Symmetry: C3
Subunit: 519 residues, 3 copies
């Protein structure tokens, strides 16, 4: 296919504008980001918080309805991936960097400071509200988007694009018109900013880790961590060949290293306490699910707005911005699966992986805090993991391994996001241009680095603010995608013979009633 | 022309007239009896109300989710005679309107200011959740049960449009025409009269408060209430005896338009952002606390929630059970040809969402005022809350008048609809009843409401609530039996006969086989 | 023929326990305490997690397509009427345990509170009593009974725990060493769970005799006499070769339990109990997942001892009872569907337990609130009679409760012994009466051994040894889930579609790999 320049040029111009604003005009960019966060949070926290749970309800009911039997492909089709392989391939979609960053920080900071409507030093609350942001809502969003693309491209044979999934609502004219172009541009921009958030978190934490081992300098975030991890691997893996064979190796190394780190912290750490937190975390998450889903700026006597902006609305925006990439990824590896099976796997397997990960790491941190040891230290979120690792025997080698894992996650996430963006910018071609992929990867890495540099001391806050503002337009795209998906599922070939009969009988009944009214 | 059911008219008419005379000429005796009867009823049946109120919700969810959800309310492969949008629009009628207007400000504001048993004061989430508790799912679960029973009896099986006909599976045709069916219909008419009189009394009281606030009348004297009720009853009487159904549908459209206008005015001129924040908060805290409130009895809070329960939750239970004949028959009428699952889902969810939005807007504005220093509580009279809320907003002087007009139109339309259903139930389930019987029933409900308001005196809302609870207690058992009748009716469907006969035959064979095996050794 | 390879190890372990307990009491008690500490600290997480995984698993199995499978031949209707089947679920379950903890558990939760909650809270006191007795125990029993019933009726295998693992180990492991190990573990777990029940019954009977002033004070010789008398009546019933006396006792169990519950209901605070019914159910559904998430590091690392005393003990007790109740449920529930079986087994005993605990615990808590108090010296065994004597006419009801405990002793012994004889007779339903008598005597001896060894801390001894003996069978019950899923998936009604899916998926994988290789060009 050809390049959709009408969709590349707008998004690329927006990205260049954001980068120039952040780099050359740090103060103005930071002020604007703070003001836009204030306005967006105050005026649309209701939208984020309401539709986060509407997505979960919607995907659950879609799975449990008659559409669950539909198969993503030809009728009576069987899937191309084994169930074990299908489950394993979902690891590459999850947050390697997000988990590596927040596994220790989030449960520990919620244990220490508490959350709105709750007191400090509550393990159940800490683990439950860590599981709130990471288990069902993100993967309900991802299931919705991936199911939309899967039904559009496999069942109906349309192009693999976000705009195509809206064909039921806006028709073909809209899909090829200005509205389809707008949807595709918003998808590309949201993916860019959502991936740049992860790249910024990973670079920040890698710098902190290098400082922990005492091998770092000050400008390493810009001069080494970003540009090296981008150029020396991602470009040479993309531009050199269609498949560089390094992405597969790194995607397997991610699994191996994450398993090794989790097993180290599990065995060397307080194993019994972690095993106690498994059922405790799951039970206290299921108990507090709706209480946390109803936490708005009007909660805790109006004092929850700042916390929600810093913690919950940030995650809403982050997951919404991830939606296009993760949806395309899940759709690509789920052909032939049924809708019910797809939804169940996508919702539950990563939820369990996240639950276990947070159990190990947050539980070790909370147990240390309870005993008297404090991995908190200064309080930086990027230094908690290495403090936790160093607190355990043989922690130096594992800290180095954690830095290696962070670098591999950086490379893998950037490469996969660039692949999906290139596909979306090339009229839905599965194998997009290599140079378009490299350009989009450069753009994402540059945006993440620019957010970090503009934030400076408050790098994390600047990152979160720009992610929150950048994902506001795509929240409505996902909301309308729910409607488009329902309208597409209803108008399935298997249901048309029943729908015509229902329409005919309803018309007969309505005309009979109208005639009786005339009488 | 179905003959008049005099044997069902007289037992309910005599009770209504006895209540009117007793409450008018003997205000003190009537109030004392109502108070004592509330004490006894609440003490010895709050467990029944609270348990079966949630059993209704569970029963409806199970019925929709079970194999019965695919059955059509009519002949097989039938289709609805109303478009889905028209069905949803018609659902708004037969709701409260007057209850929603009366309580939208008062109830969440009251819970926020004073708290609820087992919880502390100044809790927005708890106030909104326990307001949603009384107005969203258990109400419409009860209405779905009754309307589904009536719809199945009348469309699928082709019986009369009655509540006794829904008990045929339990007591049979002889029972339906026997004394038990007559008793069920009498209780249905009594419950309709008292559930309607409660809303009419609330509307008259709030219109009096509005006239007092608008300065049209200096005070809301008893004669003011009498005049309001007389004028509104005269309007309803003219609408009915005129024999033309155009004016009533015009007033229904006006009710929808004016309710939307008031909601939009408070949403826009009020704290829009807080109103929108309270939507997810209200829903989440409702689903979080659902079973905590479902398990709230007089034994909660170390045995101290009895007075609060009788004031709010048991009163609502009685009110929503008293409405059950009217709202059930209304929903049954407009739901021809729908499947059981579709009927249940729409009836449960659409009104719940509308109530959620209404309470969010009005209660959230009141609570936002409370938090910011302003207090529309004033003297604390419930009837004066709404006009305190509107008069605290720019341009609200005219919207208070619009609120009074909306209350008047709600009064007229609700009286007409309830009286139409009552006339149906007193004429062997005729779809259209005699004009004079409908007029008489509507005037009787108005007279009961006026009697309650006047006998209450300085405490009118309390007397209204007490009489509502006492009058609705008998029909809780009718609804409970209707659950069994509905299950038996759905089980004995034509599509399920062959499978059931196969199972019965095989079961007899297996039982004789095991009896023989025991005989062996 | 006797499976001596299974009898001899179980007999050796049981006799070793008896010799250790009587001969060396200090050593036995020290080992029991140390083993309780170790197993609790290291596997309370396993107990707590899998107790709720069982509920999730059985609910999902009932909901899924497997719920349509019929236990037996296709179109085979059940042998017992639904009334008979429902009533037969009372013989299997817990009568002695219910009588022992009917008052003690809610009363002590109300008095002392539970981890993460304040004391003197009726809602939690009843919700966490319902937690330990309603859905987790019966989820375990339903899983085990369903596995046994499917293996023995659908597939025609022998009625054993070993034959239910055939999906995982083939007939080679079913008859190999692993099947023998599973059978031995099932026998030992049944012996020790039934011994825990019998020891509780003997303690309660001694407490009742002390209360009735028949004995001046309890003594070890009194417990020995009680256990000897009851097991002698048992041995006579078993060796007599006539089950008429046992059927009489099993009916007397229901009659007397219903009589006692109705007495406490009518003569106790009826309205408070009725209030507690919906309160208990609602607070159970509200707090279900908060109680399911209670671990050794809840309430700031202070719930370990409370969990070991209450929650982990009940988990171990149910897991040790699971072979018996599973075999019982499989025997009486042939021809049922998986969905019907699961729903009935989960819901009927849960409702019965809810009513029982509502009555007795609500009576105790209402006495505590009003000013009275049945706590007395704090002994768990003395609470029930302390509750009875507080009510008028309780002097006779104390002896009625003692008689009921004796009948429960005999009948529970006989059902457990019959299951053990079936296990040791290669799954033969008509178990040898001498093996049955030997197993019953061994159970009584183990219960007496735990009581005597514990002495003053008799209940602690019982619970410690029960947890230790039930720890091994937890993994068997966990593996039953996988074995049952493999049984159900590989069913004749699904094998054709499974073959079609396998072939199509192989074609799809071949296409994808060939396409990838082609594109790799
Ligand atoms: C924590 C919370 C938890 C909550 C959990 C919630 C979870 C939900 C689970 C959902 C599961 C669904 C699964 C089953 C689906 C099966 C349905 C189906 O299709 O079966 C056929 C079944 C029957 O079919 P039918 O007989 O043909 O029906 C006729 C159609 O109704 C009449 O035809 P039509 O005119 O509609 O035709 C239009 C056509 C296609 O439409 C078009 O013509 C499209 C035109 C193009 C528009 C542009 C689209 C492109 C936009 C993309 C986004 C871009 C953004 C970019 C951003 C840029 C920023 C810079 O659409 C359709 O195909 C019909 C579906 C329309 C759905 C309408 C529902 C509106 C909901 C309103 C309430 C909620 C709003 C929330 C507001 C927020 C605050 C609360 O369909 C229906 O169910 C239809 C009825 C649906 C309900 C209608 C409701 C009307 C208004 C309700 C208001 C009152 C209630 C709300 C609360 C109270 C407010 C006061
Ligand atoms: C105090 C509160 C509780 C405290 C907490 C404790 C928990 C409560 C204990 C519950 C324990 C579990 C259940 C045990 C019951 C076992 C028996 C049974 O019903 O199962 C066998 C049941 C019947 O089988 P069967 O015994 O073989 O029947 C044929 C025999 O030939 C039988 O031969 P037959 O045909 O001659 O049998 C007689 C009858 C056919 O049925 C019978 O066998 C007799 C009636 C059945 C007993 C029902 C027990 C279970 C339900 C509890 C009732 C209350 C709440 C639920 C309401 C019912 C909705 C299903 O047929 C007739 O000829 C009609 C005779 C008249 C019937 C009664 C009519 C009067 C109703 C009473 C109320 C009226 C006014 C006073 C109001 C009261 C003051 C508060 O078998 C089935 O499974 C059939 C299923 C039918 C369709 C299922 C779909 C509907 C279910 C919806 C879900 C409900 C949600 C509720 C959840 C709420 C949670 C908060
Ligand atoms: C320790 C680290 C790892 C832990 C990870 C946890 C893993 C859990 C993942 C759950 C399974 C995901 C993969 C499922 C693939 C197989 C298909 C499947 O399970 O779904 C079927 C769904 O089948 C059903 O019909 C519904 C069955 C319900 C199964 C529910 C199991 C999950 C229950 C979750 C409980 C709550 C968990 C905690 C939530 C936070 C498929 O339906 P179908 O349309 O193909 O029809 C098949 C058949 O005809 C039956 O329909
Ligand atoms: C919250 C506001 C935003 C909502 C966004 C919705 C986005 C999707 C829109 C898709 C268009 C259709 C919307 C209306 C759907 C109604 C439900 C529905 O269709 O249910 C189907 C699937 O049903 C389900 O499994 C459940 C449906 C969803 C309802 C459950 C929602 C739970 C919400 C509870 C909230 C708490 C209550 C108080 C607060 C409101 C089938 O049932 P039916 O009635 O259409 O047909 C029945 C029969 O087969 C004949 O057709
Ligand atoms: C604690 C008190 C008891 C529990 C109360 C809460 C219960 C909530 C959940 C109840 C779920 C019941 C769902 C029933 C769906 C039936 C589905 C169906 O089509 O039937 C199948 C499953 O069948 C069943 O299991 C039928 C059981 C239905 C009865 C359910 C009773 C609910 C509880 C009643 C007591 C309520 C007490 C409330 C007061 C506290 C087919 O199986 P079968 O062919 O063997 O069934 C034969 C039957 O005649 C077919 O209709």
């Amino acid at each position: 296919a050809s390049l959709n320049w009408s969709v590349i040029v707008p998004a690329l111009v927006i990205v260049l504008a954001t980068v120039v604003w952040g780099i050359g005009f740090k103060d103005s960019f930071t002020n604007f980001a703070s003001s836009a966060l204030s306005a967006v949070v105050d005026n649309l926290g209701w939208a984020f918080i309401l539709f986060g749970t509407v997505f979960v309800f919607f995907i659950v009911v879609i799975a449990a309805s008659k559409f669950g039997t539909i198969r993503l492909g030809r009728i009576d089709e069987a899937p191309e991936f084994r169930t074990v392989s299908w489950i394993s391939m979902m690891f590459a979609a999850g947050e390697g960097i997000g988990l590596m960053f927040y596994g220790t920080t989030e449960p520990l900071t919620f244990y220490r400071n508490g959350v709105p409507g709750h007191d400090e030093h509550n393990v159940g609350v800490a683990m439950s509200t860590t599981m709130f942001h990471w288990t069902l809502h993100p993967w309900a969003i991802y299931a919705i988007v991936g199911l939309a693309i899967a039904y559009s491209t496999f069942r109906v044979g349309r192009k693999q694009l976000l705009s195509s999934a809206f064909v039921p609502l806006i028709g073909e004219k809209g899909a090829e018109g200005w509205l389809g172009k707008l949807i595709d541009i918003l998808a590309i921009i949201a993916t860019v900013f959502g991936t740049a958030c992860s790249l910024g978190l990973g670079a920040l934490q890698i710098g902190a880790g290098l400082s922990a081992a005492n091998i770092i300098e000050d400008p390493s975030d810009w001069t080494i961590v970003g540009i090296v991890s981008v150029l020396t691997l991602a470009f040479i893996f993309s531009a050199i060949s269609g498949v560089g064979k390094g992405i597969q190796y790194l995607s397997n190394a991610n699994m191996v290293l994450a398993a090794l780190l989790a097993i180290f912290v599990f065995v060397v750490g307080p194993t019994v306490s972690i095993l106690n937190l498994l059922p405790g975390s799951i039970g206290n998450y299921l108990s507090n699910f709706f209480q946390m889903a109803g936490r708005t700026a009007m909660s805790a006597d109006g004092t929850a707005g700042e916390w929600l902006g810093s913690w919950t609305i940030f995650y809403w925006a982050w997951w919404i911005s991830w939606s296009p990439f993760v949806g395309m990824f899940l759709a690509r590896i789920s052909r032939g699966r049924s809708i019910r099976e797809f939804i169940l796997g996508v919702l539950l397997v990563p939820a369990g992986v996240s639950t276990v990960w947070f159990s190990i790491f947050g539980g070790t941190a909370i147990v240390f805090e309870q005993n008297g040891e404090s991995i908190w230290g200064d309080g930086a979120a990027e230094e908690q993991l290495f403090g936790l690792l160093h607190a355990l025997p043989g922690g130096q080698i594992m800290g180095i391994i954690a830095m290696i894992l962070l670098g591999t996650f950086f490379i893998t996430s950037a490469d996969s996001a660039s692949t999906v963006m290139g596909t979306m910018s090339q009229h839905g071609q599965l194998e997009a241009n290599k140079w378009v992929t490299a350009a989009w990867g450069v753009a994402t890495a540059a945006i993440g680095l620019t957010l970090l540099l503009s934030g400076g001391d408050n790098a994390l806050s600047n990152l979160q603010n720009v992610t929150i503002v950048a994902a506001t337009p795509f929240l409505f795209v996902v909301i309308g995608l729910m409607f488009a998906l329902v309208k597409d599922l209803s108008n399935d070939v298997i249901y048309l013979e029943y729908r015509e009969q229902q329409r005919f009988n309803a018309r007969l009944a309505r005309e009979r009633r109208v005639h009786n009214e005339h009488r």
